[PDB]
Design an enzyme around this catalytic site. Structure first.
Site, PDB file in Angstrom:
ATOM      1  N   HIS A 105       0.809  -1.218   0.000  1.00 32.98           N
ATOM      2  CA  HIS A 105       0.000   0.000   0.000  1.00 32.98           C
ATOM      3  C   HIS A 105       0.852   1.282   0.000  1.00 32.98           C
ATOM      4  O   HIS A 105       0.277   2.376  -0.062  1.00 32.98           O
ATOM      5  CB  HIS A 105      -1.075   0.014   1.086  1.00 32.98           C
ATOM      6  CG  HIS A 105      -0.579   0.129   2.492  1.00 32.98           C
ATOM      7  ND1 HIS A 105      -0.498  -0.981   3.310  1.00 32.98           N
ATOM      8  CD2 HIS A 105      -0.258   1.229   3.213  1.00 32.98           C
ATOM      9  CE1 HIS A 105      -0.085  -0.528   4.483  1.00 32.98           C
ATOM     10  NE2 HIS A 105       0.083   0.794   4.472  1.00 32.98           N
ATOM     11  N   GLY A 138       2.135   5.747   9.736  1.00 37.69           N
ATOM     12  CA  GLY A 138       3.544   5.778   9.365  1.00 37.69           C
ATOM     13  C   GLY A 138       4.316   4.571   9.889  1.00 37.69           C
ATOM     14  O   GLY A 138       5.442   4.330   9.451  1.00 37.69           O
ATOM     15  N   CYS A 187       3.610   1.489   9.316  1.00 37.46           N
ATOM     16  CA  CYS A 187       3.523   0.396   8.356  1.00 37.46           C
ATOM     17  C   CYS A 187       4.889  -0.043   7.875  1.00 37.46           C
ATOM     18  O   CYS A 187       5.807   0.772   7.707  1.00 37.46           O
ATOM     19  CB  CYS A 187       2.593   0.742   7.199  1.00 37.46           C
ATOM     20  SG  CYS A 187       0.944   1.279   7.724  1.00 37.46           S
TER      21      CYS A 187
HETATM   22  O1  LIG Z   1      -4.295   1.662   8.611  1.00 34.48           O
HETATM   23  C1  LIG Z   1      -3.419   2.251   7.986  1.00 34.48           C
HETATM   24  C2  LIG Z   1      -3.607   2.693   6.547  1.00 34.48           C
HETATM   25  C3  LIG Z   1      -4.332   1.636   5.749  1.00 34.48           C
HETATM   26  C4  LIG Z   1      -5.702   1.717   5.541  1.00 34.48           C
HETATM   27  C5  LIG Z   1      -6.404   0.650   5.001  1.00 34.48           C
HETATM   28  C6  LIG Z   1      -5.737  -0.510   4.635  1.00 34.48           C
HETATM   29  C7  LIG Z   1      -4.368  -0.561   4.791  1.00 34.48           C
HETATM   30 CL1  LIG Z   1      -3.504  -1.986   4.281  1.00 34.48          CL
HETATM   31  C8  LIG Z   1      -3.659   0.488   5.341  1.00 34.48           C
HETATM   32  N1  LIG Z   1      -2.194   2.530   8.518  1.00 34.48           N
HETATM   33  C9  LIG Z   1      -1.855   2.215   9.831  1.00 34.48           C
HETATM   34  C10 LIG Z   1      -1.157   1.186  10.371  1.00 34.48           C
HETATM   35  N2  LIG Z   1      -1.142   1.257  11.734  1.00 34.48           N
HETATM   36  C11 LIG Z   1      -1.835   2.356  12.036  1.00 34.48           C
HETATM   37  C12 LIG Z   1      -2.147   2.942  13.284  1.00 34.48           C
HETATM   38  C13 LIG Z   1      -2.885   4.090  13.320  1.00 34.48           C
HETATM   39  C14 LIG Z   1      -3.333   4.704  12.123  1.00 34.48           C
HETATM   40  C15 LIG Z   1      -3.038   4.150  10.927  1.00 34.48           C
HETATM   41  N3  LIG Z   1      -2.294   2.985  10.883  1.00 34.48           N
END
Ligand SMILES: O=C(Cc1cccc(Cl)c1)Nc1cnc2ccccn12
Ligand SMILES: O=C(Cc1cccc(Cl)c1)Nc1cnc2ccccn12
EC number: 3.4.19.12
Lengths: 304, 304
Positions: free
Chosen positions: A41, A143, A145
């Site tokens: 992503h 961030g 990820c």
């Molecule tokens: O959730 C996402 C973005 C996203 C949205 C939908 C699908 C996918 Cl694969 C990725 N990033 C993320 C990772 N951990 C966190 C903690 C908090 C906020 C955001 N975070």
């Protein structure tokens, strides 16, 4: 003595963290040999995260669109490919800090350390478990990820997890290092059901043995139980059924303490039915399930 | 989201760990520049640990009696000296992995990461607090002596603790890197009183703000209190008195959540007087006090 949620020393993994930027998105990558691994992503914008066609999005990208930075040096991208939900960016330089490593797909109930990172820089390390429902209860912000989970056996790092997303429920989901999600999750911004989680019974029992080893014995009783009787209680309290494989795995701890596994089950049964009555076990007021029998033996024997 | 007992990434400290052997005793040492620091009880045998005369014991030792090993290479000892309860072994080679570092004496209630080591090899990393009574509730086995506690600020490691002993009560005691014990402890095998410990009030409040930030708000109420009224409750429950300095330190968290510090105190008062009623806050059934306001801001903002 003492019992803590101990993480593996993170040094070998810190040496692998890089920053991966594609367009406007920046996340963490894992540099092993001449390959950088990161969540696919990284190629998305917020507009297409609702329903991304990763194949089509990746086609608009070339090697020069992936900016990989290791500390302050830029890595040269000579290849890119998507494997499930991860991108593998081939770089022209092998990571000189690459440890001896393996990619493993861990089983639910197993534990691992997470090195939380932002912009390719490590911020902290914590120990967690893969929940029976394949989520992790981590600590991650936007961030994070590409941050990874791992176990260390002497000089070998077994990478088992890469962080991808936070569900609307606040729990975390991710993949193995081949990009296969743990659980039913998809990398799309849609509501996703995690499903019923259970308490990892074998880990709770391992932690009860750790309590006995460290002097906390108030919960030990004059009772015993059977696997069948105990499992009826485990069912009522959303605990995973205990099997002979679990009893076998608890063998070393049963031998060290001289407390039969079914006698420890009767202690657990009484704790489930009657609660803690305001008392604690190893500084906790609830039954802890994020320590495996292996973790207990390791922490109580001092494996380096 | 999510809130974990996160430790600093341990890499910079792993690169400093060495094994120090003197006679029959082996413990951990910390190699910074051309000096190896370790607990002075490395020169003792079990016979003289009851009442050691360290000055006389050290006189029978020469540079060649201190065996310092870094991984598989032997370091050459060209000087030795005792500073309080630590030995400083001057070696002929500066540690090439020496990070930017400082030695600091932390205050009770402050937190730090511990890299538990055995035979100069790291086994795990965990976050803990210096208790108001100057003990630490760690996880250490025999041979862990010389393991260190530290904080990291960007690229600077502030070493604040070196492990020396486990009291008969199972709690841990040690020194700053100048060899001065935290608390009234002496490095002798004698019964030693730790003294009454209290709950670090400011850390509990910081953790209540972390709970609000992460969605756990069930404990918030329609009440407020005064510093004086709250402190009468803190007295009854063995909580350290809250001061205006503590309120000031909680300023950033009060601003982020829009919950006045005295309103959060009223929530804490009701929790102290009524308990949790079987509910949890951030996965805990007790009030957590080993997260400072700084730790909460750091974990909730993602400082690397
Ligand atoms: O959730 C996402 C973005 C996203 C949205 C939908 C699908 C996918 Cl694969 C990725 N990033 C993320 C990772 N951990 C966190 C903690 C908090 C906020 C955001 N975070
Ligand atoms: O307690 C001692 C030896 C000792 C005795 C008396 C005084 C001094 Cl300074 C040192 N070592 C140690 C450190 N941590 C642990 C955990 C468990 C067992 C032993 N541990």
């Amino acid at each position: 003595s003492g019992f803590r949620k101990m993480a593996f020393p993170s040094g070998k993994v810190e040496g692998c963290m890089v920053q991966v930027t594609c367009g406007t998105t920046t996340l963490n990558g894992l540099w092993l040999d001449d390959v950088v691994y990161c969540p696919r992503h990284v190629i998305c914008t917020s507009e297409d995260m609702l329903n991304p066609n990763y194949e089509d999005l990746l086609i608009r990208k070339s090697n020069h669109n992936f900016l990989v930075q290791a500390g302050n040096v830029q890595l040269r991208v000579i290849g890119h490919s998507m494997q499930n939900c991860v991108l593998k960016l081939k770089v022209d330089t092998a990571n000189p800090k690459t440890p001896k490593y393996k990619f493993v797909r861990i089983q639910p109930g197993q534990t691992f350390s997470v090195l939380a990172c932002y912009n390719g820089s490590p911020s902290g390390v914590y120990q967690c478990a893969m929940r029976p429902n394949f989520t992790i209860k981590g600590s991650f912000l936007n961030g994070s990820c590409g941050s990874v989970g791992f176990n260390i056996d002497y000089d070998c790092v077994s990478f088992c997890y890469m962080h991808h997303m936070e569900l609307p429920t606040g729990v975390h989901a991710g993949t193995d290092l081949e990009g296969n999600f743990y659980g039913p999750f998809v990398d799309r911004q849609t509501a996703q059901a995690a499903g019923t989680d259970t308490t990892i019974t074998v880990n709770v029992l391992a932690w009860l043995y750790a309590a006995v080893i460290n002097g906390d014995r108030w919960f030990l009783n004059r009772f015993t139980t059977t696997l069948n009787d105990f499992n009826l209680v485990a069912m009522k309290y959303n605990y995973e059924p205990l099997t002979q494989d679990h009893v076998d795995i608890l063998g070393p701890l049963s031998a060290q303490t001289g407390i039969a596994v079914l006698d420890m089950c009767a202690s657990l049964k009484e704790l489930l039915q009657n609660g803690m009555n305001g008392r604690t076990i190893l500084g906790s007021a609830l039954l802890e399930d994020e320590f495996t029998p292996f973790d207990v033996v390791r922490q109580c024997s001092g494996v380096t």
